[PDB]
């Protein structure tokens, strides 16, 4: 632990995102983080090249999705407008 690198990318949905995410919990955590598991080819994030597998999500489309289920998290993420603001963190063990 030494303060990760969180950043939000502003991209437009051409025809979907095409990626994978997994919910993980721990101690002293009353919420759930939408981590990244993989990225589908030809996706808005894959083609542009911003996020990668093994990352952590915080905010999507300017929405504080801190403490939601994967279903509500992923669903809301894909359920965004033309503009998308995904805030991913830089880390790894």
């Amino acid at each position: 632990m030494k303060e990760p690198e969180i950043i939000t990318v502003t991209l437009k949905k051409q025809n979907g995102m095409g990626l994978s995410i997994v919910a993980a919990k721990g101690a002293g955590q009353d919420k759930l983080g939408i981590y990244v598991k993989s990225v589908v080819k030809g996706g808005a994030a894959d083609v542009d090249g911003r996020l990668a597998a093994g990352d952590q999500l915080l905010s999507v489309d300017g929405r504080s999705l801190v403490g939601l289920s994967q279903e509500r998290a992923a669903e809301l993420m894909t359920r965004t407008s033309s503009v998308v603001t995904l805030e991913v963190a830089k880390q790894g063990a």
Binding site: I21, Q70, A74, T78
Partner: peptide, 6 residues
């Protein structure tokens, strides 16, 4: 702890 696709 599942893996969905958005």
């Amino acid at each position: 702890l599942f893996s969905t696709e958005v």
